[PDB]
Design a protein around this ligand. Structure first.
Ligand SMILES: C=CC1=C(C)[C@@H](Cc2[nH]c(/C=C3N=C(/C=C4\NC(=O)[C@H](C)[C@H]4CC)C(C)=C\3CCC(=O)O)c(CCC(=O)O)c2C)NC1=O
Ligand SMILES: C=CC1=C(C)[C@@H](Cc2[nH]c(/C=C3N=C(/C=C4\NC(=O)[C@H](C)[C@H]4CC)C(C)=C\3CCC(=O)O)c(CCC(=O)O)c2C)NC1=O
Ligand SMILES: C=CC1=C(C)[C@@H](Cc2[nH]c(/C=C3N=C(/C=C4\NC(=O)[C@H](C)[C@H]4CC)C(C)=C\3CCC(=O)O)c(CCC(=O)O)c2C)NC1=O
Ligand SMILES: C=CC1=C(C)[C@@H](Cc2[nH]c(/C=C3N=C(/C=C4\NC(=O)[C@H](C)[C@H]4CC)C(C)=C\3CCC(=O)O)c(CCC(=O)O)c2C)NC1=O
Ligand SMILES: CCC1=C(C)/C(=C/C2=NC(=C\c3[nH]c(/C=C4\NC(=O)[C@H](C)[C@H]4CC)c(C)c3CCC(=O)O)/C(CCC(=O)O)=C2C)NC1=O
Ligand SMILES: CCC1=C(C)/C(=C/C2=NC(=C\c3[nH]c(/C=C4\NC(=O)[C@H](C)[C@H]4CC)c(C)c3CCC(=O)O)/C(CCC(=O)O)=C2C)NC1=O
Ligand SMILES: CCC1=C(C)/C(=C/C2=NC(=C\c3[nH]c(/C=C4\NC(=O)[C@H](C)[C@H]4CC)c(C)c3CCC(=O)O)/C(CCC(=O)O)=C2C)NC1=O
Ligand SMILES: CCC1=C(C)/C(=C/C2=NC(=C\c3[nH]c(/C=C4\NC(=O)[C@H](C)[C@H]4CC)c(C)c3CCC(=O)O)/C(CCC(=O)O)=C2C)NC1=O
Ligand SMILES: CCC1=C(C)/C(=C/C2=NC(=C\c3[nH]c(/C=C4\NC(=O)[C@H](C)[C@H]4CC)c(C)c3CCC(=O)O)/C(CCC(=O)O)=C2C)NC1=O
Lengths: 92, 160, 160, 177, 103, 206, 100, 161, 161, 161, 160
């Protein structure tokens, strides 16, 4: 279901990205960032634009924001376009 | 509620609501008169449902209240009953919403992280909700006790 | 450096450094000054060594020095010693931060396409570094040159 | 001038529409509490001769330089006009509570009152307090929480007409600011 | 400078303030009569801060991130032995990436 | 050739790139609420009162707000003989309590642009908790006693900022009394004599 | 002072939050498993074990009203520090008044 | 994404209090109209294509946005319209059932007027299409149900403006 | 992502010069504290859950962010905190070993205060949690090691402010 | 992504009219230069590596962006250049064949100057590299073909500026 | 071990082992004489390290052994000490492997699922390992106690 079942350290599925997203979450951000690949010079793949602006969901913004810095990216701006704040029920 | 997730179900599928979805929103709102009566019973029985709820909880789990238990002393025992007042409140929300969606994103999502991080035995708080369930279903008829008890055991399932 | 490899390599698993890794930082920091004492020995012999590197890279490869080769001319040969100076400067970085990243984030990653767009034969540069390692043995005693030997042949392995 | 019936006409003329089933539930609910609105205008106009002396004299005990010589409530002719525009404003707010829309407020009362009060030299910030005591009185009479005269009513909620008459005094107090 | 040894501990006594109280004597007074002061100085004699204190941020390094590429803002120790000069020079740069040397 | 051309590429295109600048989803350029106002140079008391009063955390949030931030001439216009009665008491340093609601009456949940108020009168309650009537007729958009000066300022989270001419006081806001003296009754026999006995209440005595 | 008074209103709001349950658990039968009579093995909890009593004793107690109380004691320390700083500032202002 | 019950529970929960008489008073008001909304959403699901065909033919079918140069000329561009109008008639159906327009700005309104300006889509003709679509929707579901479904159409038109 | 050795090599490399006496002088200063940092990072790894449990109970456990309406009410929201506080205590451990706070703004600070404003997370209570977490960290690792680990906590608090 | 024929068809289609004498007049002008563009794109494909090697050695080879601290110092950074210059010489070849610079801003120009500012890439040295690359391209393909290939180089330099 | 994951690290990166990796395999095997002495001390002290380990565990957590505790009676208390003999054994593996890789995939991966599914308080077994750590480090010098204790606290960290 959601990503906070009871998993933490020392648990059977591997220790990973745990987001505070509810059941079928409907909140999503509008993020903007550059993310240079830092791996094209030994792989020699084709080049793709690294400056992107896209709507990521609340269910997986934290994983994406945690990963964009993994590969040296810089986050220029993020906002919560869709969803409420301090909302107990209704994020579903 | 059943209205909001029957929508977001058909929302994701790029379609409207089927008869299977619209004959149940219809069936739920005619059920709404009976739901408020059930939640009205638990609303002003929280004095007995909570206090007798913590009654059986300490008789079944004296460790948590004994010296060394998490709810030891005048202080923690008050908060020991405070959480039961919380979860008894969320069950009143689930009965009126016709689903554990209110109980889902309040008191259930990531609950093991909180209680593990508070040092509280999560199995102990599960025992507390079960003791409240026998008090709650003892206050209602058989047709209602299949509902009010029905939301407690979901909270029991997610709390372990 | 080496601590950076442990912080990074422990960071993608979302955990603190384990028992073995903290050895790898602790043992690296206890051998600290000996890299510091060693690099000052090599910095005082950079004019020592690159003069000896130009000895044998060109008696081995007079193709590059001759009229028509890339290194023909004064100003082409002028930077020729500069590339030795930057490489020897890079190795002092690698000898200090006890790993290969300063030899890899600089110098190695994409070196062939740099030289191939310059006309420098990439095989000749491999012998240039092999010549440079041959030159460092004379101005360095047997104790510490096998400390610096594995940092040279990584460059040769990186260039192929 | 418009009312609450013909505000949704000229809104439905803006989309070239007939006034169909979507908009008539806004208006059949408006005549559903039509007995409530007339019970709210009757609380205003029955104390309207006393509310205007309650509100102009509340402005004087706050800003007493008006009755100071050289002021704007010093001359006795100049005092009797300030009792008049306390109740002409209360005449046009009570038409706006009656009609249910503030067009007659914003085409007859406030139609040039701002350049009137500049050109008469009337202090505008004291005209706010002459208006806003009548805002705090009319929301006390319509909710029947006036602290010295209670009127008889069939009981029930009235707080929408309280905020409606508070919305008409703020369109007066913003148009002359 | 404290050059007022002409002015002692008895500067602003203001001896001639005189109150007649009618036709009788002048009732001379030496009331000090302070100003509408305020004594405009910063960083006074004590701290006056009890907690609530994490205000410190580094200065902006431009486009990179703060304090990351201070490899252009250092002093130096050496320069090397051969070092061919630049001859095109293309402007001094704002630190020539958010990536460092050790990328 | 039609004037309202469009965006896109390939065939069926008007010679204008997608999005008018080749960007379909444009990254925004606005700042948030409080430093869009900080750059304006007119909302100086407003941003400062927000920072002191702790309300500024609330209008930091991403919810679509419609702030009615008064320019400091409005704050400078608080020296009414009238309005100074009900608002001067907030200048005391303990009365931050009412300062948050009075400032929280200027935040409106939702993005109400002035173009969205074409002869429309809609009310709403603030984040303070009490209703406010926004009133747009004859292109004179009103917010209580606002009489808005500048139309709209686009902000970060789809929020709007309108410049008002005065400070809106909440409807059921009573001014805090000045700090007083706790007074105590000097005698006790002047108060037993102040209470009517049962024999007085039945008219048995004068 | 007027953020220490806001701390006291948060302590009064934290007790009213838990007072339906603080008095509802006051007439329950909470029997522990060990710790009270010496015939049962309690282990560490004969008293408390090996350094876990704390610098004060109230810092080992958890709760919403104990956590805002530690906020009060750190906020009253900063007020008392600056109230003793206006005392010796007032001494030096009166000590310089005896030279004129 | 909150319905009338979710919004009532949120406001009653956000103050930490139980569902008092005022909170349940609105909830009873929503359950009374529960029978009306389903039948309203019933017929709208049936006549989805017919309603959109009626709106475009009544508002913007023959105007010069339909002709060459207009904003709706090419078949890809025309086909995007009825795809686009389908969401307005669909999401308005969701708001009519949920009794709360939170889903509209959550999933429709945000970045919408900022998107049409990018593409160069005429917001003026868009609202009149929705207004005409609101007019036909009052035909099917009746008067009061049209008042309910119509209450979310102009919510889209207001925010999209 | 540079440690003290990486930052020293970068500044000495960015001028194209060798590692002179001043560059190695700081490197020797870092190797002297190499023994202190590992033991500091040792005990922090052991008492990670205990430190975070001590900080929240000492700073924001019973405040009204914990109660209904406060920013930390629901169990998902409470569980996000200790998940969130774990990164601050973890990344601060990385800065304490690397001897350079470059990893913090690279992977924590950038887009952080801009993210909490989006969610509406109170930055004021966040810093006091980290300040209280800094206070307990000085308990375990000692005084000077607490001075080192504490030097990166307020770096987070400064930039997050 | 339109060529000269696609752009001619679009403008003639966007008014809903047939291909009149003026639309075909430009199309005949494009077919006349069809023989020149292929031979221009022929030799550029052959001497792709030689042209880029000539441009960098003639514009920015020995400048201090090439030295330490300059924007092109490390081998990864140097290798990114000739990778980067390859696109300019390649996409300019596409514009020379298609006879329309729509592909450049579609696939090169958009987000380009906004990307170099992020990385801190010097736009000044970039344009002079493309200008020098334009100078050698006029050597190979001739004068008029160089005028054609050169017409898209400065289009990149203009928008990238 | 340090040998196997220094390989699989450089294995994934398509490269050989750097000097940073090969000067530590070298540094680890010369450390191997001292590791076997340390593990030899814990090998035939399991009688005291376990029995005194469960000594402080019960004197600190009497709930787990009291009636109702998971390790109640003659039966569970024997298994109560059996797990400590397990974890004391894995620490001897980690000391000889120079890493918690043996302790990782034995007794740590998914340990919370087992003990939660056995009804055992996972915090209680963490208290048991800490009591063994003070007994173990009391048997060795300061240079060794920084290692033998070092592997216990990693097990403490992963066990909560
Ligand atoms: C239909 C719209 C309509 C109104 C709103 C009123 C308001 C109004 N008052 C006056 C005229 C006046 N109005 C005021 C009023 C005031 N001065 C104050 O300090 C107080 C704040 C305020 C009273 C509450 C005074 C003092 C005069 C007298 C000026 C004079 O006689 O020269 C005039 C000019 C008339 C004239 O003198 O010829 C008008 C138009 N009358 C109208 O016909
Ligand atoms: C210095 C002079 C001075 C005054 C004269 C009073 C005037 C006054 N009264 C009210 C407030 C009010 N004023 C009235 C008016 C009246 N009550 C009635 O029953 C009659 C109809 C009418 C007097 C004839 C009413 C009904 C209220 C609302 C509350 C109430 O009294 O029940 C207010 C607004 C609230 C406030 O600001 O306090 C003011 C200014 N106050 C002052 O400070
Ligand atoms: C107890 C305190 C005390 C004083 C304040 C003065 C006040 C004062 N002056 C004069 C009396 C006088 N005062 C003045 C002075 C002046 N007249 C002018 O026209 C000039 C403007 C001004 C000069 C500066 C003169 C000229 C006389 C009258 C001659 C004299 O008596 O000296 C008198 C006597 C008046 C009388 O006869 O009734 C008194 C009481 N004397 C006092 O004993
Ligand atoms: C809500 C808004 C607000 C105000 C309007 C002021 C009003 C005010 N002033 C004073 C209190 C005072 N006010 C004065 C002022 C004066 N006395 C004089 O003789 C002069 C003519 C005049 C100054 C020009 C003095 C001298 C005090 C005594 C305390 C002091 O000097 O600090 C007090 C304290 C009452 C007391 O303890 O006696 C209050 C409430 N304060 C507020 O909070
Ligand atoms: C590694 C650097 C880094 C950080 C720090 C980070 C933070 C971060 N904190 C979040 C939420 C959150 N953070 C909090 C935190 C708090 N509430 C309070 O009252 C306290 C002041 C505070 C705890 C100290 C809460 C309650 C949420 C949930 C918000 C919501 O559900 O709306 C989220 C949203 C998604 C998720 O949690 O799954 C992110 C991405 N991400 C990162 O990559
Ligand atoms: C830090 C890592 C690094 C390196 C190595 C580097 C090299 C480099 N070598 C160059 C040229 C050159 N390099 C050589 C080199 C040689 N001829 C020989 O016979 C030899 C084997 C060899 C030198 C030892 C020649 C001949 C040229 C000039 C080619 C030309 O422009 O015609 C150039 C063009 C500009 C210049 O000379 O500065 C660069 C950038 N840049 C870097 O950033
Ligand atoms: C609505 C969903 C929800 C829940 C459930 C919740 C729980 C919650 N329980 C708490 C404490 C606590 N909870 C307990 C509970 C117990 N002790 C026992 O022995 C029993 C097994 C158990 C109760 C049946 C104790 C002792 C504390 C205080 C712990 C301490 O002071 O360290 C606290 C910290 C203090 C506070 O702010 O109240 C929270 C936030 N919050 C929520 O929003
Ligand atoms: C097809 C259209 C298109 C372009 C043009 C493009 C450019 C682009 N250039 C990049 C980097 C780069 N570009 C350069 C270029 C230069 N340095 C200099 O001094 C010169 C002025 C210049 C060479 C002319 C360098 C050095 C980097 C590496 C920057 C870094 O590692 O920080 C990167 C980062 C990722 C990567 O290279 O893998 C992108 C995405 N992407 C595209 O999709
Ligand atoms: C090598 C890694 C490893 C571990 C750790 C392990 C544990 C393990 N512990 C068990 C039981 C048990 N473990 C306990 C433990 C405890 N009771 C307490 O009060 C204490 C807190 C705690 C010990 C310190 C008890 C009471 C049982 C029996 C439970 C039952 O009978 O239901 C069992 C089932 C019986 C058995 O096969 O032994 C397993 C498999 N297996 C492994 O392979």
């Amino acid at each position: 279901a959601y990503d906070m079942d009871g998993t933490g350290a020392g648990s059977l599925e591997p220790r990973g990205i745990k987001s505070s997203a509810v059941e079928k979450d409907s909140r999503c951000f509008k993020v903007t960032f550059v993310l240079p690949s830092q791996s094209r010079l030994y792989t020699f793949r084709e080049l793709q634009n690294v400056y992107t602006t896209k709507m990521v969901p609340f269910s997986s913004w934290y994983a994406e924001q945690q990963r964009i810095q993994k590969m040296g990216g810089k986050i220029l701006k993020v906002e919560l376009v869709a969803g409420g704040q301090m909302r107990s029920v209704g994020n579903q | 509620s059943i209205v909001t997730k029957s929508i977001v179900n058909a929302d994701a599928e790029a379609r409207y609501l089927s008869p299977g979805e619209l004959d149940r929103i219809k069936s739920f709102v005619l059920s709404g008169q009976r739901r408020l009566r059930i939640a009205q019973t638990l609303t002003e029985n929280r004095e007995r449902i909570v206090k007798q709820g913590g009654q059986q909880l300490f008789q079944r789990r004296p460790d948590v209240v004994s010296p060394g238990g998490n709810a030891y002393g005048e202080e923690m025992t008050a908060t020991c009953l405070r959480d039961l007042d919380y979860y008894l409140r969320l069950v009143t929300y689930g009965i009126i919403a016709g689903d554990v969606t209110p109980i889902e994103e309040i008191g259930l999502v990531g609950v093991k992280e909180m209680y593990s991080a508070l040092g509280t035995p999560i199995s102990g708080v599960a025992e507390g909700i079960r003791c409240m369930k026998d008090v709650a279903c003892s206050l209602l008829s058989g047709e209602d006790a299949a509902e009010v008890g029905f939301y407690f055991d979901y909270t029991l399932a997610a709390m372990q | 450096s080496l601590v950076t490899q442990v912080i990074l390599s422990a960071d993608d698993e979302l955990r603190y450094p384990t028992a073995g890794e903290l050895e790898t930082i602790s043992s690296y920091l206890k051998t600290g000054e000996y890299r510091i004492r060693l690099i000052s020995i090599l910095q005082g012999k950079e004019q020592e060594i690159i003069r000896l590197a130009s000895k044998k890279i060109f008696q081995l490869h007079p193709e590059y020095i001759a009229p028509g080769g890339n290194a023909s001319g004064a100003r082409q040969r002028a930077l020729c010693l500069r590339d030795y100076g930057w490489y020897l400067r890079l190795i002092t970085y690698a000898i200090l931060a006890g790993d290969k990243e300063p030899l890899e984030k600089i110098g190695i990653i994409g070196v062939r396409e740099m030289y191939n767009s310059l006309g420098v034969p990439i095989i000749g540069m491999i012998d240039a570094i092999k010549c440079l390692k041959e030159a460092t043995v004379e101005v360095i005693s047997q104790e510490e040159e096998d400390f610096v030997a594995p940092y040279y042949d990584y460059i040769i392995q990186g260039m192929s | 001038m418009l009312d609450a019936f013909s505000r949704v006409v000229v809104n439905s003329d803006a989309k070239a529409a007939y006034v169909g089933g979507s908009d008539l539930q806004a208006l059949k609910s408006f005549i559903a509490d039509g007995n409530k609105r007339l019970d709210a205008v009757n609380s205003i106009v029955s104390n309207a001769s006393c509310m205007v002396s309650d509100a102009v004299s509340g402005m004087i005990c706050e800003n007493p330089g008006l009755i100071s010589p050289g002021g704007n409530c010093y001359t006795n002719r100049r005092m009797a006009a300030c009792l008049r525009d306390g109740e002409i404003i209360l005449r046009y707010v009570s038409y706006a509570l009656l009609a249910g829309d503030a067009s007659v407020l914003e085409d007859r009362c406030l139609n040039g009152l701002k350049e009137t009060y500049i050109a008469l030299g009337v202090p505008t910030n004291s005209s706010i307090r002459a208006v806003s005591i009548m805002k705090a009185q009319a929301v006390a009479f319509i909710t029947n929480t006036a602290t010295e005269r209670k009127m008889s009513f069939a009981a029930g909620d009235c707080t929408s007409l309280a905020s409606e008459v508070a919305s008409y005094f703020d369109r007066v107090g913003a148009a002359i600011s | 400078d404290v050059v007022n040894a002409a002015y002692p501990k008895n500067i602003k006594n203001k001896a001639p303030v005189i109150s007649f109280d009618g036709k009788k004597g002048v009732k001379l007074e030496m009331v000090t009569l302070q100003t509408f002061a305020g004594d405009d100085s910063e960083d006074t004699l004590f701290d006056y801060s009890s907690g609530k204190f994490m205000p410190q941020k580094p200065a902006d390094m431009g486009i990179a991130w703060p304090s990351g590429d201070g490899r252009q803002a250092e002093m130096k120790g050496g320069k090397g032995s051969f070092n061919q000069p630049d001859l095109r020079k293309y402007g001094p740069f704002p630190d020539f990436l958010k990536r460092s040397m050790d990328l | 050739r039609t004037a309202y051309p469009y965006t896109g590429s390939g065939y069926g295109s008007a010679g204008v790139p997608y999005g008018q600048d080749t960007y379909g989803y444009k990254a925004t350029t606005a700042k948030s609420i409080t430093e869009t106002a900080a750059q304006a140079g007119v909302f100086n008391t407003f941003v400062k009162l927000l920072n002191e009063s702790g309300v500024e955390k609330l209008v930091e949030q991403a919810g679509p707000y419609t702030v009615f931030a008064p320019t400091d001439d409005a704050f400078a216009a608080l020296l009414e003989p009238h309005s100074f009665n009900k608002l001067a008491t907030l200048l005391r340093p303990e009365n931050n309590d009412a300062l948050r609601k009075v400032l929280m009456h200027h935040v409106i949940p939702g993005a109400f642009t002035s173009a969205s108020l074409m002869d429309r009168a809609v009310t709403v309650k603030s984040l303070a908790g009490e209703p406010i009537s926004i009133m747009g007729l004859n292109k004179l958009v009103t917010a209580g006693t606002a009489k808005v000066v500048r139309a709209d300022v686009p902000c970060a989270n789809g929020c709007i900022i309108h410049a008002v001419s005065s400070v809106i006081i909440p409807p059921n806001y009573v001014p805090v009394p000045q700090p007083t003296k706790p007074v105590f009754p000097r005698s006790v026999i002047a108060e037993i004599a102040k209470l009517p006995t049962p024999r007085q209440a039945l008219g048995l005595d004068p | 002072q007027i953020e220490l008074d806001a701390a006291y209103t948060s302590l009064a709001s934290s007790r009213a939050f838990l007072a339906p349950f603080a008095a509802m658990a006051a007439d329950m039968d909470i029997r522990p498993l060990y710790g009270k009579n010496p015939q049962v093995f309690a282990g560490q909890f004969l008293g408390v074990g090996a350094g876990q009593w704390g610098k004060t004793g109230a810092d080992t107690v958890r709760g919403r009203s104990r956590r805002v109380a530690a906020d009060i004691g750190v906020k009253e320390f900063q007020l008392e520090r600056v109230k003793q700083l206006v005392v010796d500032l007032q001494r030096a202002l009166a000590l310089e008044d005896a030279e004129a | 994404m909150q319905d009338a019950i979710t919004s009532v529970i949120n406001a009653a929960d956000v103050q930490g209090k139980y569902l008092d008489a005022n909170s349940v008073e609105k909830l009873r008001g929503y359950f009374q109209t529960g029978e009306l909304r389903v039948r309203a959403a019933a017929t709208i699901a049936a006549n989805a294509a017919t309603i959109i065909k009626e709106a475009v033919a009544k508002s913007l079918l023959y105007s010069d946005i339909t002709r060459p140069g207009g904003n709706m000329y090419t078949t890809r561009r025309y086909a995007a319209c009825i795809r686009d109008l389908d969401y307005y008639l669909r999401y308005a159906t969701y708001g009519m059932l949920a009794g709360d327009p939170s889903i509209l700005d959550e999933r429709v309104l945000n970045g919408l007027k900022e998107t049409y300006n990018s593409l160069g889509v005429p917001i003026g003709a868009t609202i009149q299409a929705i207004q005409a679509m609101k007019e036909v929707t009052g035909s099917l579901v009746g008067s009061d149900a049209g008042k309910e479904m119509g209450l979310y159409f102009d919510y889209i038109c207001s925010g999209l403006s």
